[PDB]
Amino acid sequence: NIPVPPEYKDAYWWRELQARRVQCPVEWVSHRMYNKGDRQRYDFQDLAFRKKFEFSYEEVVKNAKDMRS
Amino acid sequence: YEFHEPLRRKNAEDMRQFQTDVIDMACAMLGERLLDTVNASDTSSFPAEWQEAIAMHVEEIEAEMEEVAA
Amino acid sequence: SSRFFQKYFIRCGNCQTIQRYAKGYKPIPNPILFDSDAHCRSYHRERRDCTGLTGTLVTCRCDKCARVHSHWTVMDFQEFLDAKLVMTPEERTALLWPGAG
Amino acid sequence: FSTFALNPETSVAPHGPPRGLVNRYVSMGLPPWAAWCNKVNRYSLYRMSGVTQRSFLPKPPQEMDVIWLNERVRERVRTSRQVQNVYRQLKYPYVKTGIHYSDVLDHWVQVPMVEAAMFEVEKDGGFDNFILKRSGPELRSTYGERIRRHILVRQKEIQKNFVLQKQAQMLVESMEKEILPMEDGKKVEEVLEKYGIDKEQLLRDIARAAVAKKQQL
Amino acid sequence: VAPWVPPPRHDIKVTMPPPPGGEVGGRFGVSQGYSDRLARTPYWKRMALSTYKLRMMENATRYPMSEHRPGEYDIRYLPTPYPCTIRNRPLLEVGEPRQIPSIRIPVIFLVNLFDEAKGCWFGRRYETVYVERQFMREELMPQRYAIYATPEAYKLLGLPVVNHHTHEEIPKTPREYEKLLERQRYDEERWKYTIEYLFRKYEDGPPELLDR
Amino acid sequence: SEREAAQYKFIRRWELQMRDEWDQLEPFKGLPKPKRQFGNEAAEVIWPYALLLER
Amino acid sequence: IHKGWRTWEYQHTRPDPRPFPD
Amino acid sequence: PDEIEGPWEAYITYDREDGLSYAQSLGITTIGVATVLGLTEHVREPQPYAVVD
Amino acid sequence: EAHKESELHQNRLRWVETMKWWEEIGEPHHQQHAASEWEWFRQRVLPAKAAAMGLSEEDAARELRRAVMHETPRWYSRIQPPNARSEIKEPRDQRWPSSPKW
Amino acid sequence: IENFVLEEETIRERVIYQVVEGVFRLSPTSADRRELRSVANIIDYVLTHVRAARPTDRERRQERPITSAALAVMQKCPIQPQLGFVHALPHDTRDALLQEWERMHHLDWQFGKAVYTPRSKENVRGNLTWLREDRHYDQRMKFMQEVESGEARAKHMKLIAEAAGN
Amino acid sequence: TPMMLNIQNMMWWNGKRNLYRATYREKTWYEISRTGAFTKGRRPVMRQKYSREALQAALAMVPPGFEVADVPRPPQRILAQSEGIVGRWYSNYWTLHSMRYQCLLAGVEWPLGERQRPRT
Ligand SMILES: [Mg+2]
Ligand SMILES: [Zn+2]
């Protein structure tokens, strides 16, 4: 990345979007969009298809178990 | 280095001719302020050498003004 | 214009006091003698009024300094809750409406 | 809808929920058009509620070359006086050729805008304030990016020049105290080479200052 | 490929997710902000870096409204995450005919400007004057004669700061503009609406009690 | 064809205000006429509605 | 589209292109 | 864990050389719930020129 | 440029007569009038109001006139006050006492 | 008045011998003399060699040091320049004669293209940037007055004080 | 545009796609359409139900010089939702009144004002 004095930063607005974007045609990764489970599990902000954080299974179980629920 | 150096070189140049410009503007300011202390106040002026020279350059600028007018 | 009641908090630009301005029910231009032109622009101006009085120059009469003007600044109630809550109680008496303790 | 002559305004509609078909849709928050709908199902309702906006830019925003701040190509559905047919047609904003004297860089600039943009530019106090207030994705023009770069650069140059002349002030204030008394012809030159000022150019613009003052009178 | 993917935008605060991007500035279309940093950090570490005081400050809701984009509705509480149409509206609707009467702009003169053709003053120094839009942008402004009447312009010139609300309401009809004009001159020149000026004819008794 | 007609009406009007053919009582035709009197000028004067709202 | 096809009667899946690729 | 509030430390980077002496001549005992325990010069391994070039 | 025609010619001649009435003797008189009467205001009324409004002779002038809007034939708001009383709408066509339709 | 005289075999031979050799002591090459065929060519040739004969700024700088007293005065100013800005203006890769072409017309200033020519002094009237950054300078000066007078120390000290008292 | 000509470009159908449209719809038209899930009629909007001293400790943090009458019921355009008790919770209409009803069931005295109905 190249450091830049902030007031000049606006001409790069598009470049900065291409970085946050997923690196493919969105076509290829489209399936994350279609099923309900992955609409929740994936971050779609400015087309970055990237799995959000998720607890493992035993994580979840020992998390629910010490609430005694 | 090949890319980056000719830049800081240019920056150094500009700082340099900046100093220069400070000095030139300072000359001008000196010009009108000294003229002011001489004409508005009194008892003080430069050498009659500087006075004849100043008068001469004034006449030359005046002639260039007459010619550049038309 | 306008179908629904709405409340606004308005600040007088001249003396900086906040008074509350209401806009109530006025009936639609009659559907039986129909004017498309009136109806449509009243619909758009209605959506405009429903939001923050956007395209409108607000003209009222200020109570503290009593005169009619448009210097008025309209505030969404959060800005109002910011304005109000940091005010010492005796300048509430000055700037705001009676009560408003 | 009131049949009365005088309808002083009320907090709530006085006679109960407003009669008439148009008022049905009005109270729903839909446009007065809706009374002309034959298909009233969920999809059509949702469609004309206008919640979602169907309209587009001519180019994708990174390639957009003109300033349309909020303007889209919209599509208007109209009807012939032979009413069995219903057609739709696209509608475009009025792009006026922007010619504005930019203040920070001293010159006229012509970067093509929309009407809304010109009213905007008067609202913002000049062309340049209008360009700098906007940011990035806000101004989607490429043209905008270029003259914004120029405006910025030139601005920082203005500042540079200000600093310049303040330096000049400090200098002449420092040497003034020195040569303020008349003193001598030779004494002044010591001051002149101590500050690195040449004699004959000082003479030259002392003369140009003289000419300057007597010229206007 | 993207070496170094840029971080979520407004992300500064310890225990709470960033605002939805595009509400800060960025690409719209999603109502929940997310940062991998916040989520990957174990709950206890998030807590350990905070206090009950600091927490209740960044929990803080400003509910319908948004902070980062003043005066508007926060997109995450709108039905679709895109920013509101009504406040961002285009000047002309789909069916609306264009009739926008020539509008006049308040403008501050930086010099005394005398009109010789009409033998009268265009404007005096530091005098706000309503002028023709074209006349201003085309002529006064490219010379240094006048600038726009914006409040910050009063601030810079040193004069007491007033707001003319230029083009807050841009009239789409001639009569609409005649109303706007009316209220405008009811504000701008109010010396016309004081009772002494209504009575100009009598600063004294009735005119039929006078002399020839 | 509206704007220039308007122009005509303003110019014409000002002319008649110099030459005193202008009658300000035109909008008020239906109203009763006030007292013609030496203190009552307050009655003839056309009042701005806003300044009535003010007081 | 003068008259639209009945697309509601199809579950959403991509058919194979008839000049099938080898 | 929230009753702990152990000794938080804060690094303050002054753009000049004299920062330590300054912060000590300010004479701050407390910010009023905090009670600053101490000031000290935080010794860094002096960074090469390569980092800023 | 037809003159042999009656109403095309006499009308636009009426027009140019009117518009050449304006900028000659009319317009400088309108301007002069507007100037002269503000001039009247500030040395007669304003001394009282400045004393009243709690300002000086100066700041009250920038206050009472916050901008200069001079009326020109292309920019004017209205000719005359709108009608005080608007006449009463009868039912559809000479129906009495009421009409079923509109 | 206006005379544009094309050259020939003889007339060029004597014209150059009298004008550029006689008056200007200027020395032509074979390629030069091949290219000398008009009156514009000879005059801008001489113009070229005279302008290149002039001293550069490297030479001017080494005849004119900037005195230690002068620069020591410029040091003690509250404000020094930013001075990197030139690098940020957009450069385009294109022909030089088309850039010549559009500035022959008015085309050069149009589409967000604007020509940067470095200035020294400005028009101060009606210039918002000048004004606003200048106001900035004023409140800077009154701030320094507040520092020298001692109130800076005091305001800060009572800020500390009421921070501790809470 | 082909959407104007009523062309079906759906990807499962011809492989194409309509050009002017978003690539990701976080909610499609159907569940934008359903206003019952969005607006608050007939529906609880604050899910957590607080104990007595819980409620009293929540009210404890409302700043003095605050009335209920100054917090307008947001329009239908706006989602109805509540964060539970967070900072400046009294500023959220739905949270404010939900809390008020919780206080009513709990026999907790209600310090703030009540909603005023202005009339002409
Ligand atoms: Mg899966
Ligand atoms: Zn007021």
PDB file of N, CA and C in Angstrom, chain H:
ATOM      1  N   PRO H   1     -13.795  -9.672  36.872  1.00  0.00           N
ATOM      2  CA  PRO H   1     -12.783  -9.127  35.968  1.00  0.00           C
ATOM      3  C   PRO H   1     -12.891  -7.619  35.780  1.00  0.00           C
ATOM      4  N   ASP H   2     -14.083  -7.074  35.973  1.00  0.00           N
ATOM      5  CA  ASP H   2     -14.280  -5.645  35.799  1.00  0.00           C
ATOM      6  C   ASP H   2     -14.094  -4.891  37.106  1.00  0.00           C
ATOM      7  N   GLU H   3     -13.854  -5.624  38.186  1.00  0.00           N
ATOM      8  CA  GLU H   3     -13.491  -5.007  39.451  1.00  0.00           C
ATOM      9  C   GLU H   3     -11.982  -4.868  39.542  1.00  0.00           C
ATOM     10  N   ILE H   4     -11.278  -5.430  38.567  1.00  0.00           N
ATOM     11  CA  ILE H   4      -9.821  -5.404  38.592  1.00  0.00           C
ATOM     12  C   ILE H   4      -9.313  -4.001  38.271  1.00  0.00           C
ATOM     13  N   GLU H   5      -9.513  -3.547  37.033  1.00  0.00           N
ATOM     14  CA  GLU H   5      -8.971  -2.264  36.577  1.00  0.00           C
ATOM     15  C   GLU H   5      -7.527  -2.121  37.013  1.00  0.00           C
ATOM     16  N   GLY H   6      -6.672  -3.009  36.521  1.00  0.00           N
ATOM     17  CA  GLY H   6      -5.283  -3.032  36.932  1.00  0.00           C
ATOM     18  C   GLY H   6      -4.557  -1.824  36.392  1.00  0.00           C
ATOM     19  N   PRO H   7      -3.238  -1.807  36.545  1.00  0.00           N
ATOM     20  CA  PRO H   7      -2.480  -0.602  36.206  1.00  0.00           C
ATOM     21  C   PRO H   7      -2.371  -0.390  34.698  1.00  0.00           C
ATOM     22  N   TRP H   8      -3.385   0.232  34.096  1.00  0.00           N
ATOM     23  CA  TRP H   8      -3.332   0.620  32.685  1.00  0.00           C
ATOM     24  C   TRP H   8      -2.088   1.426  32.390  1.00  0.00           C
ATOM     25  N   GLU H   9      -1.445   1.189  31.255  1.00  0.00           N
ATOM     26  CA  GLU H   9      -0.348   2.073  30.888  1.00  0.00           C
ATOM     27  C   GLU H   9      -0.624   2.738  29.553  1.00  0.00           C
ATOM     28  N   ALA H  10      -0.209   3.988  29.432  1.00  0.00           N
ATOM     29  CA  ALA H  10      -0.443   4.742  28.214  1.00  0.00           C
ATOM     30  C   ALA H  10       0.870   5.285  27.669  1.00  0.00           C
ATOM     31  N   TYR H  11       1.081   5.072  26.379  1.00  0.00           N
ATOM     32  CA  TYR H  11       2.243   5.585  25.688  1.00  0.00           C
ATOM     33  C   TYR H  11       1.887   6.873  24.970  1.00  0.00           C
ATOM     34  N   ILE H  12       2.597   7.937  25.312  1.00  0.00           N
ATOM     35  CA  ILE H  12       2.353   9.244  24.725  1.00  0.00           C
ATOM     36  C   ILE H  12       3.548   9.652  23.876  1.00  0.00           C
ATOM     37  N   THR H  13       3.356   9.822  22.570  1.00  0.00           N
ATOM     38  CA  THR H  13       4.508  10.106  21.721  1.00  0.00           C
ATOM     39  C   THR H  13       4.612  11.585  21.384  1.00  0.00           C
ATOM     40  N   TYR H  14       5.549  12.263  22.033  1.00  0.00           N
ATOM     41  CA  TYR H  14       5.761  13.685  21.807  1.00  0.00           C
ATOM     42  C   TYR H  14       6.682  13.880  20.617  1.00  0.00           C
ATOM     43  N   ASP H  15       6.359  14.867  19.790  1.00  0.00           N
ATOM     44  CA  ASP H  15       7.098  15.087  18.556  1.00  0.00           C
ATOM     45  C   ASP H  15       8.455  15.744  18.797  1.00  0.00           C
ATOM     46  N   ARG H  16       8.670  16.253  20.007  1.00  0.00           N
ATOM     47  CA  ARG H  16       9.965  16.812  20.357  1.00  0.00           C
ATOM     48  C   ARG H  16      10.734  15.901  21.312  1.00  0.00           C
ATOM     49  N   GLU H  17      11.953  16.305  21.660  1.00  0.00           N
ATOM     50  CA  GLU H  17      12.847  15.472  22.463  1.00  0.00           C
ATOM     51  C   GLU H  17      12.617  15.530  23.970  1.00  0.00           C
ATOM     52  N   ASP H  18      12.007  16.617  24.425  1.00  0.00           N
ATOM     53  CA  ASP H  18      11.988  16.982  25.838  1.00  0.00           C
ATOM     54  C   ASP H  18      10.773  16.487  26.616  1.00  0.00           C
ATOM     55  N   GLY H  19       9.944  15.666  25.978  1.00  0.00           N
ATOM     56  CA  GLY H  19       8.634  15.324  26.507  1.00  0.00           C
ATOM     57  C   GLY H  19       8.566  14.954  27.982  1.00  0.00           C
ATOM     58  N   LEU H  20       9.501  14.121  28.431  1.00  0.00           N
ATOM     59  CA  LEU H  20       9.511  13.620  29.804  1.00  0.00           C
ATOM     60  C   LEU H  20       9.497  14.752  30.839  1.00  0.00           C
ATOM     61  N   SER H  21      10.490  15.629  30.728  1.00  0.00           N
ATOM     62  CA  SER H  21      10.639  16.768  31.623  1.00  0.00           C
ATOM     63  C   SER H  21       9.384  17.635  31.627  1.00  0.00           C
ATOM     64  N   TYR H  22       8.760  17.771  30.461  1.00  0.00           N
ATOM     65  CA  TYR H  22       7.541  18.557  30.345  1.00  0.00           C
ATOM     66  C   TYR H  22       6.396  17.938  31.135  1.00  0.00           C
ATOM     67  N   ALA H  23       6.106  16.673  30.841  1.00  0.00           N
ATOM     68  CA  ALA H  23       5.012  15.966  31.503  1.00  0.00           C
ATOM     69  C   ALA H  23       5.212  15.916  33.014  1.00  0.00           C
ATOM     70  N   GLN H  24       6.466  15.977  33.458  1.00  0.00           N
ATOM     71  CA  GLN H  24       6.739  16.053  34.894  1.00  0.00           C
ATOM     72  C   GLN H  24       6.559  17.466  35.457  1.00  0.00           C
ATOM     73  N   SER H  25       6.863  18.484  34.658  1.00  0.00           N
ATOM     74  CA  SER H  25       6.668  19.861  35.111  1.00  0.00           C
ATOM     75  C   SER H  25       5.191  20.263  35.044  1.00  0.00           C
ATOM     76  N   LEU H  26       4.360  19.393  34.478  1.00  0.00           N
ATOM     77  CA  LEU H  26       2.915  19.620  34.508  1.00  0.00           C
ATOM     78  C   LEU H  26       2.318  19.335  35.890  1.00  0.00           C
ATOM     79  N   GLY H  27       2.957  18.442  36.645  1.00  0.00           N
ATOM     80  CA  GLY H  27       2.538  18.153  38.007  1.00  0.00           C
ATOM     81  C   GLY H  27       1.141  17.569  38.140  1.00  0.00           C
ATOM     82  N   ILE H  28       0.906  16.431  37.492  1.00  0.00           N
ATOM     83  CA  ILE H  28      -0.403  15.783  37.538  1.00  0.00           C
ATOM     84  C   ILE H  28      -0.431  14.580  38.480  1.00  0.00           C
ATOM     85  N   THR H  29      -1.134  14.732  39.598  1.00  0.00           N
ATOM     86  CA  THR H  29      -1.351  13.633  40.536  1.00  0.00           C
ATOM     87  C   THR H  29      -2.502  12.725  40.113  1.00  0.00           C
ATOM     88  N   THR H  30      -3.585  13.325  39.621  1.00  0.00           N
ATOM     89  CA  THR H  30      -4.759  12.559  39.199  1.00  0.00           C
ATOM     90  C   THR H  30      -5.641  13.259  38.151  1.00  0.00           C
ATOM     91  N   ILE H  31      -6.288  12.470  37.294  1.00  0.00           N
ATOM     92  CA  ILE H  31      -7.330  12.999  36.407  1.00  0.00           C
ATOM     93  C   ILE H  31      -8.706  12.808  37.050  1.00  0.00           C
ATOM     94  N   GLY H  32      -8.676  12.391  38.309  1.00  0.00           N
ATOM     95  CA  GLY H  32      -9.802  12.503  39.221  1.00  0.00           C
ATOM     96  C   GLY H  32     -10.589  11.257  39.569  1.00  0.00           C
ATOM     97  N   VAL H  33     -10.636  10.255  38.701  1.00  0.00           N
ATOM     98  CA  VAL H  33     -10.808   8.904  39.221  1.00  0.00           C
ATOM     99  C   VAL H  33      -9.542   8.055  39.070  1.00  0.00           C
ATOM    100  N   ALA H  34      -8.588   8.543  38.281  1.00  0.00           N
ATOM    101  CA  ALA H  34      -7.497   7.691  37.801  1.00  0.00           C
ATOM    102  C   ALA H  34      -6.270   7.528  38.708  1.00  0.00           C
ATOM    103  N   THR H  35      -5.769   8.620  39.285  1.00  0.00           N
ATOM    104  CA  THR H  35      -4.553   8.580  40.111  1.00  0.00           C
ATOM    105  C   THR H  35      -3.332   8.010  39.377  1.00  0.00           C
ATOM    106  N   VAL H  36      -2.748   8.799  38.479  1.00  0.00           N
ATOM    107  CA  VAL H  36      -1.544   8.378  37.763  1.00  0.00           C
ATOM    108  C   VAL H  36      -0.434   7.953  38.723  1.00  0.00           C
ATOM    109  N   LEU H  37       0.054   6.731  38.534  1.00  0.00           N
ATOM    110  CA  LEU H  37       1.049   6.160  39.430  1.00  0.00           C
ATOM    111  C   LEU H  37       2.432   6.718  39.156  1.00  0.00           C
ATOM    112  N   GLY H  38       2.827   6.752  37.888  1.00  0.00           N
ATOM    113  CA  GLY H  38       4.127   7.301  37.558  1.00  0.00           C
ATOM    114  C   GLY H  38       4.398   7.645  36.105  1.00  0.00           C
ATOM    115  N   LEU H  39       5.331   8.574  35.928  1.00  0.00           N
ATOM    116  CA  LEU H  39       5.881   8.904  34.623  1.00  0.00           C
ATOM    117  C   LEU H  39       7.205   8.202  34.464  1.00  0.00           C
ATOM    118  N   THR H  40       7.489   7.731  33.264  1.00  0.00           N
ATOM    119  CA  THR H  40       8.843   7.276  32.998  1.00  0.00           C
ATOM    120  C   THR H  40       9.198   7.429  31.530  1.00  0.00           C
ATOM    121  N   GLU H  41      10.486   7.580  31.263  1.00  0.00           N
ATOM    122  CA  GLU H  41      10.958   7.551  29.901  1.00  0.00           C
ATOM    123  C   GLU H  41      10.862   6.113  29.411  1.00  0.00           C
ATOM    124  N   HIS H  42      10.154   5.909  28.305  1.00  0.00           N
ATOM    125  CA  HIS H  42      10.021   4.573  27.729  1.00  0.00           C
ATOM    126  C   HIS H  42      11.122   4.373  26.707  1.00  0.00           C
ATOM    127  N   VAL H  43      12.072   3.507  27.027  1.00  0.00           N
ATOM    128  CA  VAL H  43      13.259   3.419  26.197  1.00  0.00           C
ATOM    129  C   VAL H  43      12.990   2.518  25.015  1.00  0.00           C
ATOM    130  N   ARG H  44      13.106   3.104  23.835  1.00  0.00           N
ATOM    131  CA  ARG H  44      12.955   2.373  22.598  1.00  0.00           C
ATOM    132  C   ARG H  44      14.323   2.092  22.017  1.00  0.00           C
ATOM    133  N   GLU H  45      14.441   0.964  21.333  1.00  0.00           N
ATOM    134  CA  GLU H  45      15.604   0.716  20.502  1.00  0.00           C
ATOM    135  C   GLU H  45      15.581   1.746  19.364  1.00  0.00           C
ATOM    136  N   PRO H  46      16.601   2.629  19.301  1.00  0.00           N
ATOM    137  CA  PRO H  46      16.577   3.730  18.325  1.00  0.00           C
ATOM    138  C   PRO H  46      16.435   3.230  16.894  1.00  0.00           C
ATOM    139  N   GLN H  47      15.450   3.766  16.184  1.00  0.00           N
ATOM    140  CA  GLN H  47      15.075   3.211  14.892  1.00  0.00           C
ATOM    141  C   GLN H  47      16.012   3.700  13.807  1.00  0.00           C
ATOM    142  N   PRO H  48      16.360   2.812  12.864  1.00  0.00           N
ATOM    143  CA  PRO H  48      17.265   3.184  11.774  1.00  0.00           C
ATOM    144  C   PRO H  48      16.614   4.174  10.816  1.00  0.00           C
ATOM    145  N   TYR H  49      17.374   4.647   9.836  1.00  0.00           N
ATOM    146  CA  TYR H  49      16.876   5.644   8.905  1.00  0.00           C
ATOM    147  C   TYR H  49      16.040   4.983   7.828  1.00  0.00           C
ATOM    148  N   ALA H  50      16.212   3.676   7.704  1.00  0.00           N
ATOM    149  CA  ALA H  50      15.515   2.921   6.681  1.00  0.00           C
ATOM    150  C   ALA H  50      14.004   2.957   6.887  1.00  0.00           C
ATOM    151  N   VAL H  51      13.574   3.098   8.133  1.00  0.00           N
ATOM    152  CA  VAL H  51      12.154   3.042   8.449  1.00  0.00           C
ATOM    153  C   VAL H  51      11.411   4.274   7.949  1.00  0.00           C
ATOM    154  N   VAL H  52      12.066   5.426   7.977  1.00  0.00           N
ATOM    155  CA  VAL H  52      11.391   6.650   7.580  1.00  0.00           C
ATOM    156  C   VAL H  52      11.662   7.062   6.130  1.00  0.00           C
ATOM    157  N   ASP H  53      12.548   6.340   5.453  1.00  0.00           N
ATOM    158  CA  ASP H  53      12.921   6.718   4.093  1.00  0.00           C
ATOM    159  C   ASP H  53      11.969   6.160   3.037  1.00  0.00           C
TER     160      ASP H  53
END
